[PDB]
Amino acid sequence: SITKDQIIEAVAAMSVMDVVELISAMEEKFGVSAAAAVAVAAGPVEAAEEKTEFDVILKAAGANKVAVIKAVRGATGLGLKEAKDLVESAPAALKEGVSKDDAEALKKALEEAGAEVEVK
Amino acid sequence: SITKDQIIEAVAAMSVMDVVELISAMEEKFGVSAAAAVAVAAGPVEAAEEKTEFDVILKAAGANKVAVIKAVRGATGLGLKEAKDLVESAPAALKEGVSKDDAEALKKALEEAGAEVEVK
Structure with a gap:
């Protein structure tokens, strides 16, 4: 069977x-x-x-949304719109796990414009 | 068993x-x-x-069929002849549904040579 x-x-x-x-x-x-x-x-x-591996967050664009938007798209390359929305959707993470040098580079840029940045 | x-x-x-x-x-x-x-x-x-998805069409090789032929076979890889005929059979589609970057890359190349290109 x-x-x-x-x-x-x-x-x-x-x-x-x-x-x-x-x-x-x-x-x-x-x-x-x-x-x-x-x-x-x-x-x-x-x-x-x-x-x-430093993370750069954007808290407040400040009274220089223009320069900010530049720094944003400049650090990333997102469409003008995307960048706009991003900032408008603050807080918004700018970069994640980037070199310290780069983090501080943009950071200083924000300061030069007069914006509030966050480093974590 | x-x-x-x-x-x-x-x-x-x-x-x-x-x-x-x-x-x-x-x-x-x-x-x-x-x-x-x-x-x-x-x-x-x-x-x-x-x-x-951009399409690069060739309208007129201009007064630089040489450079053109290069750009052609260079962008494709068709036999010298095939390429020749292609250009000679203008207008002729160079590429279809290619990245914008690529489209503009060849486009600028055509311009450098002095040819008439079409972007659609």
């Missing part, structure tokens, strides 16, 4: 592992596998980390 | 169709065919469309 049904209850008789091995077996035997795999995804790490 | 291997030779004992039923049985039984749908294609069609 080597029916197909009996084979069904057979797989439901063994452990998942046994099922993995089986499937894996046939896969090779009948050669019905896309032996290749693809996904790409990972993220290594190790002591001795750097500190060049 | 229900070994993993014995099962392998079992699948190679029946027809493909009969096997399809086998595999199918388990699929339904263990219901191992219904675990949400993370994604597959991911590309719906809704408002908020982009504008990066």
Whole structure:
């Protein structure tokens, strides 16, 4: 009685592992596998980390929305509109995880114009 | 005598169709065919469309068919001849649905040579 049904209850008789091995077996035997795999995804790490991830937030454009808008699109490159809305939607994050030098560069720019910036 | 291997030779004992039923049985039984749908294609069609599909047409090569021919084959890679005929068959579409940056890149190139281009 080597029916197909009996084979069904057979797989439901063994452990998942046994099922993995089986499937894996046939896969090779009948050669019905896309032996290749693809996904790409990972993220290594190790002591001795750097500190060049500063976030520049914009609190108040101040009485110089003009210069600000410039600094914005200038630091990013978003459409005039997008930039406008951004500022108009204050507070708004200008940059995230950028080099300190860059952060302070724009920061000083905001100050020169007379705007309120946030560094975190 | 229900070994993993014995099962392998079992699948190679029946027809493909009969096997399809086998595999199918388990699929339904263990219901191992219904675990949400993370994604597959991911590309719906809704408002908020982009504008990066510009067409660069060539109207007149001008008094610089040489430079033009270069720009042509350079932007495409068609045989010297093909390119020649193309230009000689003006007007001729250079590119279709290409990035604006690219469109303007060749455009400026044509201008540098002194040719008439069309952007649509």
